[PDB]
Amino acid sequence: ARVIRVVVVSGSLRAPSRTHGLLQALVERLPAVLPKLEVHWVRIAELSASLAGSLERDSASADLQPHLQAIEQADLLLVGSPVYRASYTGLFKHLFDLVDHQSLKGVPVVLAATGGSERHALMIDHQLRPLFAFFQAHTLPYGLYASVESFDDQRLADPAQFERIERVLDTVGAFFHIPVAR
Ligand code: NA
């Protein structure tokens, strides 16, 4: 079996964050569907310095290069952003403005977001999904959207979200043709 390279992009501007907690909950259950995997994180909240210094892919700062390569070489991408101005954060977007635009074609992508309100639940399908559709990535059908009520501080605490995570993982296992049994 091939080790599946999983890269997790957390778009929060600050740490700790509910978006991070949502991504952790997903990541924690990932080994139940993938027999071999390496999981790596790209956390915007720690990259503001490297991000500012990077205006083109080929000229990106040496310290951002590892994060870009990881995304560009991932077998599976999990992405999450809190909702800002009814979309993902601009710094999360700046990251993807640098990511090679041929590199994600056909790559499975899980979309996730956290918001202050349910009113922006459509950000998943009208903002995050189109972003990854530009890359022609294989966005997976079930996106995660959790508003503030789903969390205890920054930890996911909502049984309905834990269940939807399991449905996401069903689709991850199916995509990698992992013989369906857990
Ligand atoms: Na790739």
UniProtKB/Swiss-Prot annotation:
This enzyme's EC code(s): 1.5.1.38
Xref: InterPro entries: Flavoprotein-like_sf, FMN_Rdtase-like_dom, FMN_Rdtase_MsuE-like, NAD(P)H-dep_FMN_reductase
Pfam families: FMN_red
Enzyme class: oxidoreductase
Catalytic activity: FMNH2 + NADP(+) = FMN + NADPH + 2 H(+)
Keywords per UniProt: Flavoprotein, FMN, NADP, Oxidoreductase
Domain of life: Bacteria
Gene3D superfamilies: 3.40.50.360
Gene Ontology molecular-function annotations: FMN reductase (NADPH) activity; oxidoreductase activity, acting on NAD(P)H, quinone or similar compound as acceptor
Family: Belongs to the SsuE family.
Official protein name in the record: FMN reductase (NADPH)
Gene: msuE
